[PDB]
Amino acid sequence: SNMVKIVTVKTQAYQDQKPGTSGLRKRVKVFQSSANYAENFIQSIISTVEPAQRQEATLVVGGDGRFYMKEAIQLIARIAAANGIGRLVIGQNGILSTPAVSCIIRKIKAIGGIILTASHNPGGPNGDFGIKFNISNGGPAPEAITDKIFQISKTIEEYAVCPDLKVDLGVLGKQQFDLENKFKPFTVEIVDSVEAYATMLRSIFDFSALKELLSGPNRLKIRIDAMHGVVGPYVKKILCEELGAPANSAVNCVPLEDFGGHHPDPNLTYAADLVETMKSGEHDFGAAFDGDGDRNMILGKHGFFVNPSDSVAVIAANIFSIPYFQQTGVRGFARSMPTSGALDRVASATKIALYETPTGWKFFGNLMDASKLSLCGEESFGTGSDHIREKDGLWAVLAWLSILATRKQSVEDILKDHWQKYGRNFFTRYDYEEVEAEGANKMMKDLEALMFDRSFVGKQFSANDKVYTVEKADNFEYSDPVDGSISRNQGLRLIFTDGSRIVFRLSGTGSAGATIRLYIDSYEKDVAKINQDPQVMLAPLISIALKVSQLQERTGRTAPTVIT
Ligand SMILES: O=P(O)(O)OC[C@H]1O[C@H](O)[C@H](O)[C@@H](O)[C@@H]1O
Numbered sequence: 001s002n003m004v005k006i007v008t009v010k011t012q013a014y015q016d017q018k019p020g021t022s023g024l025r026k027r028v029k030v031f032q033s034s035a036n037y038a039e040n041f042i043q044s045i046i047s048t049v050e051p052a053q054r055q056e057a058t059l060v061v062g063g064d065g066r067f068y069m070k071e072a073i074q075l076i077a078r079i080a081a082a083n084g085i086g087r088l089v090i091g092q093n094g095i096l097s098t099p100a101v102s103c104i105i106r107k108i109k110a111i112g113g114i115i116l117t118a119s120h121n122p123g124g125p126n127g128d129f130g131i132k133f134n135i136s137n138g139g140p141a142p143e144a145i146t147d148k149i150f151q152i153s154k155t156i157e158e159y160a161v162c163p164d165l166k167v168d169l170g171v172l173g174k175q176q177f178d179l180e181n182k183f184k185p186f187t188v189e190i191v192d193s194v195e196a197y198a199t200m201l202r203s204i205f206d207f208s209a210l211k212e213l214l215s216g217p218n219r220l221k222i223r224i225d226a227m228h229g230v231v232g233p234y235v236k237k238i239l240c241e242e243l244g245a246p247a248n249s250a251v252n253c254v255p256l257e258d259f260g261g262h263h264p265d266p267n268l269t270y271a272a273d274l275v276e277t278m279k280s281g282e283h284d285f286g287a288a289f290d291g292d293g294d295r296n297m298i299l300g301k302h303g304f305f306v307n308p309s310d311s312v313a314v315i316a317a318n319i320f321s322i323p324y325f326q327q328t329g330v331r332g333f334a335r336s337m338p339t340s341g342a343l344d345r346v347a348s349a350t351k352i353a354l355y356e357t358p359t360g361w362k363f364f365g366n367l368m369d370a371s372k373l374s375l376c377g378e379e380s381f382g383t384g385s386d387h388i389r390e391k392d393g394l395w396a397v398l399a400w401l402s403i404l405a406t407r408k409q410s411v412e413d414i415l416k417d418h419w420q421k422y423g424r425n426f427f428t429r430y431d432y433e434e435v436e437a438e439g440a441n442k443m444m445k446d447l448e449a450l451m452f453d454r455s456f457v458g459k460q461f462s463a464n465d466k467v468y469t470v471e472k473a474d475n476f477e478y479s480d481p482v483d484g485s486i487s488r489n490q491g492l493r494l495i496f497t498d499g500s501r502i503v504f505r506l507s508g509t510g511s512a513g514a515t516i517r518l519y520i521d522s523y524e525k526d527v528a529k530i531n532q533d534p535q536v537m538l539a540p541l542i543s544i545a546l547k548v549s550q551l552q553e554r555t556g557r558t559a560p561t562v563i564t
């Protein structure tokens, strides 16, 4: 069973195996009931590697532990072997967080990786399955490569497979497979899921300082919720075993194939258990990760909610508490365009460049690969640095713990100090889910044409005490300074003279009919206004956003589906 035949299987192409920014995501039942669905796609990824480059190539493979992952990893090995891929590096039990895969690709100079995750979407027999492809910089495959995969998948007629090859995913070490009529062996390395990632973090952060923060009498009390997803064993081996947090600090830290039956998505309703725990007042700091570990929600004593746009501003303002940045320097800051302007206040005060990018990783990774980006953030619970080429939720928690250790203040007092220094960007996102496309597209086309008229800049909108004056209004465009690409129609912005913004986007992650995302960013300098309820302070700007867009009239919605 270490010697196996290579066979050619005739297959039929599917027409919809189109990777997006985040991979190919289908319902598990589709993968199961569509013959050769996964095989076709895996073969299609590998066909993008020139045969002459396969023998010396390594692919990193792992996923978030959801149902169907181990069957898929076996299939990757069976096809990789038969196609002449020299070596796979696989996390034990198939487990690798998305940041760990990025770490390992870059550490061992793999040609890329295949991540078995649908991120924050549910899993289990009735949920979703995802297949991501990352390339040699450890980041997501860019669109030129995912298009080739899609093209290959639509006309594929056969794949090569080693049907008798079986990998033991549970034991560490090197497994070799001799292939019938092939001279060199196929090699699988099962590595510890956490080791390489933990070794990386060990050089970024001061584990001594953190261990002192988290251990003993006056320890910072923390509660970390992996939501039954991939970050679980990372929490246990790093925060508990190595840094000395008591074991009760790690909740939902055993990966479950169905993520305990819930969405592994960190926000106030999907992580309501963590929130309710934090309300008790016993713990100083709480955090939640998504299913594959690149997203994070940060909570403080009493359930104080650090909104992600503030979180990256705070890290930016205390960035040299982290030894990595002490030693590399700060090459730049970035946030997606819809993210709040809190980061800009910090970057302006410290004379560091601020990149405002369209939604999507590739803009961040481009700037990182150019040595221009050290810290980036997304209002959708994303924080990252150039230590890898994916966002990193556990990294962001360690960043926070490092800042708490040097600041010696509560999470809430750090935010109050921040807002007093930079002013506060009150922020919320309204999601209108599954609105009819005709209404939503009409709402956007009409609003854009309203904004383009000569009189729109300088117009004044008032609601209560607030007056907002239009400084600029446009449909966001981005000329990418690395790859030359021009990204257009990236979101309608109403930029007011006072620092506030309204942003409208249509979601590019198509559900079934459009979803509208309305971002409200209201800047406030007054000290008697910075400690107010955000929804109260955002109401004037929300009123204006609905009035000028005519959203209720276009869509029939009187209320968002989700407020964040
Ligand atoms: O285009 P949208 O629907 O607004 O989604 C954009 C989002 O897609 C994924 O969920 C990524 O994890 C996020 O980085 C990104 O913000």
Ligand SMILES: [Mg+2]
Pocket (backbone or CB within 6 Å): 119, 120, 290, 291, 292, 293, 294, 295
């Ligand atoms: Mg994710």
